[PDB]
Motif scaffolding. Structure first.
Motif, PDB file in Angstrom:
ATOM      1  N   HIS A  31       0.795  -1.131  -0.091  1.00  0.00           N
ATOM      2  CA  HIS A  31       0.214   0.060  -0.031  1.00  0.00           C
ATOM      3  C   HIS A  31       0.906   1.187   0.157  1.00  0.00           C
ATOM      4  O   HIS A  31       1.418   1.545   1.070  1.00  0.00           O
ATOM      5  CB  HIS A  31      -0.997  -0.020   1.216  1.00  0.00           C
ATOM      6  CG  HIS A  31      -1.770   1.255   1.409  1.00  0.00           C
ATOM      7  ND1 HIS A  31      -2.984   1.310   0.582  1.00  0.00           N
ATOM      8  CD2 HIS A  31      -1.627   2.504   1.951  1.00  0.00           C
ATOM      9  CE1 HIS A  31      -3.594   2.601   0.597  1.00  0.00           C
ATOM     10  NE2 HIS A  31      -2.643   3.314   1.502  1.00  0.00           N
ATOM     11  N   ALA A  49      -5.288   7.100   6.555  1.00  0.00           N
ATOM     12  CA  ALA A  49      -5.777   5.905   6.133  1.00  0.00           C
ATOM     13  C   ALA A  49      -6.529   4.899   6.937  1.00  0.00           C
ATOM     14  O   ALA A  49      -7.426   4.104   6.361  1.00  0.00           O
ATOM     15  CB  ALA A  49      -4.694   5.358   5.394  1.00  0.00           C
ATOM     16  N   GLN A  69      -9.227  -2.686   0.251  1.00  0.00           N
ATOM     17  CA  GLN A  69      -9.562  -1.700  -0.420  1.00  0.00           C
ATOM     18  C   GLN A  69      -8.888  -1.337  -1.935  1.00  0.00           C
ATOM     19  O   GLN A  69      -9.384  -1.153  -2.658  1.00  0.00           O
ATOM     20  CB  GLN A  69      -9.338  -0.328   0.452  1.00  0.00           C
ATOM     21  CG  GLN A  69     -10.386  -0.505   1.657  1.00  0.00           C
ATOM     22  CD  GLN A  69      -9.854   0.429   2.780  1.00  0.00           C
ATOM     23  OE1 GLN A  69     -10.927   0.464   3.693  1.00  0.00           O
ATOM     24  NE2 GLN A  69      -8.978   1.352   2.608  1.00  0.00           N
TER      25      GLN A  69
HETATM   26 CL   LIG Z   1      -6.543   4.590   1.484  1.00  0.00          CL
END
Ligand SMILES: [Cl-]
Ligand SMILES: [Cl-]
Length: 162
Positions: A31, A49, A69
């Motif tokens: 990420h 986040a 996500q």
């Molecule tokens: Cl995010």
């Protein structure tokens, strides 16, 4: 095998902020947090986040939530892209996973730029497409991952990951 397992193998899992292959701050399962050179900026992005004051460390559960996500976002970005959508629609399930992988690593824009390879994928000219994908900075900077992804795209099997 599936997209999640595939990406988990390529990106690995890290619970503390780290730098990816390009030197950017990242966390969890690939990420990306920020392209900025500042750790603090990365720490603020992380907190934003996750929704909590993190101290640069997250839990496995948090890492998986971001990953879900991110995978969702990648698929949605493909379907929203005029150049990508048609390609994706034309492929079988394993090959679709290879295109998601590329978008996950390089972003929609990046991938949308492989104009010629995309046109070959659409025509189902697998070997020609594979050679074309290899002529890229992507291949030269991360060759093993690229080879795995290209093999998948080319053969429509998971052999590179077994
Ligand atoms: Cl995010
Ligand atoms: Cl690599």
């Amino acid at each position: 095998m599936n997209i999640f397992e595939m990406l988990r193998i390529d990106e690995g899992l890290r619970l503390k902020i780290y730098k990816d292959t390009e030197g950017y701050y990242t966390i969890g399962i690939g990420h990306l947090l920020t392209k900025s050179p500042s750790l603090n900026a990365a720490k603020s992005e992380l907190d934003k986040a996750i929704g909590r004051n993190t101290n640069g460390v997250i839990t496995k559960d948090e890492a998986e939530k971001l990953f879900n996500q991110d995978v969702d976002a990648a698929v949605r970005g493909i379907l929203r892209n005029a150049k990508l959508k048609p390609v994706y629609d034309s492929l079988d399930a394993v090959r679709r996973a290879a295109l998601i992988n590329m978008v996950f690593q390089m972003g929609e824009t990046g991938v949308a730029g492989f104009t010629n390879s995309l046109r070959m994928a659409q025509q189902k000219r697998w070997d020609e497409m594979a050679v074309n994908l290899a002529k890229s900075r992507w291949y030269n900077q991360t060759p093993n991952r690229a080879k795995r992804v290209i093999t998948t795209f080319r053969t429509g099997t998971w052999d590179a990951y077994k």
